[PDB]
Symmetry: C3
């Protein structure tokens, strides 16, 4: 119960543009007041599988959203499928869907929901990953905490790029970050 994850296999678990077009590998490990997070993405099919910005000059970003309720349970409007998200058991998941994971949620005082008051940038973490592990193929992973509606907590990953890629498969190196835990 110290780690929530997607099993680190390559079986698609995520829907960006079409059903099960991607494998998000996300590992959240609770180190007390902070969650240590490790993320990568493999797009296996559909619109975002092979990037060609000569053909499609405006296809330059997409977003994967994890939406959680008050008990830290994943909501079905999330891009990541519910069947694929649970506490670790060996290299797999527990057979039983978890009921509570509030200790893994992003802190609401650190990262408040949208309101009429001033919005601060500290609810964002920026990182760069590399497509196909090539050092000349950067893309930005923007991670934002608790900025989605229709939920109590959220983690969203926005992937974007500024270079003009021609026939580049969207599968990434890994990135580590952390965030302040709710409890």
């Amino acid at each position: 119960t110290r780690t929530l994850w997607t099993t680190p296999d390559t079986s698609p678990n995520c829907t960006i543009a079409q059903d099960k077009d991607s494998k998000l590998t996300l590992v959240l490990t609770k180190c007390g007041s902070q969650i240590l997070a490790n993320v990568s993405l493999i797009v296996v099919a559909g619109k975002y599988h092979i990037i060609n910005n000569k053909t499609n000059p405006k296809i330059k970003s997409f977003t994967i959203k994890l939406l959680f309720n008050k008990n830290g349970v994943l909501l079905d409007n999330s891009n990541l499928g519910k069947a694929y998200w649970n506490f670790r058991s060996g290299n797999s998941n527990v057979s039983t869907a978890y009921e509570k994971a509030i200790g893994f949620m992003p802190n609401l005082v650190a990262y408040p929901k949208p309101s009429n008051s001033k919005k601060y940038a500290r609810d964002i973490v920026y990182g760069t990953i590399y497509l196909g592990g090539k050092p000349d193929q950067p893309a930005v992973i923007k991670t934002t905490f608790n900025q989605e509606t229709g939920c109590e907590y959220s983690i969203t990953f926005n992937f974007s790029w500024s270079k003009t890629y021609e026939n580049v498969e969207f599968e990434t190196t890994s990135f580590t970050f952390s965030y302040i835990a709710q409890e």
Copy 2:
């Protein structure tokens, strides 16, 4: 009472003095994972010289430093830029009621990161990161973190913020950055 986390609390109440009294909120969380401290930092400037950057008007305003100085018990010294009043071990979203007296296990390791001396100075006591002003991807600024290089203390953690772009009316409030360092014990 959370003895594994020293922090500023996660509120936005100013706790730090860069150019003038309580002109900023340094949000800093140090979580002890044994021999390493996992650190998470961001900064919100609310007033004074570093609140609104305009390098067309002020071409020389390009950097500033926030210093955390610690005595032999890991207690924050009052000449630090960070205030002592809300730097403490965690209790919920606030702090423990009494000011802590020992935090040596959170201090940067003196063999990894020695104080200045006649011995060769090595770069491993620095960590560089980039954060983004206002969360905008075209507004980078560098955060340079240095361990145990200040005099007049047993330990130190200093944050130097700097930028190279000519920003015009850009508020200095940052995205968050995570790093770690080797603990003293």
Copy 3:
């Protein structure tokens, strides 16, 4: 379980890049359950990579440091890092017994498979940038790859490279933090 496996934090050379004991690799691995929190820096003290001059030697642009492990997570003798002071922490030194088992500190084989003819995914790589002499205008890239070496059950390799034309620049670095998924 909560332990630290490390090189010790001293500056005594422990690593062989081009010639024997030409460098100090400072590496600290801390187990936080299913992830290992890693902290790394490098000091080259002698040999080919100590002082970089790309005006006189423009092709000297990269080098690799490898840690090879057996089925029990024990460091192999043919790694660039020496076995003598790679062990579990005790104060600012090591435990007096060389460790027998560290499978919990090894990179997860499903996340990061050994080389095979299956597709090689990029998720077994982490890129970072460190700075030579602590100077902000002297970046070098540290590319870390998991379980891509043969003749071992697990591996961590550090490739250091740079694109700037450095002139008489000493190769000693700032520190970088990353994590990886643990085997157990």
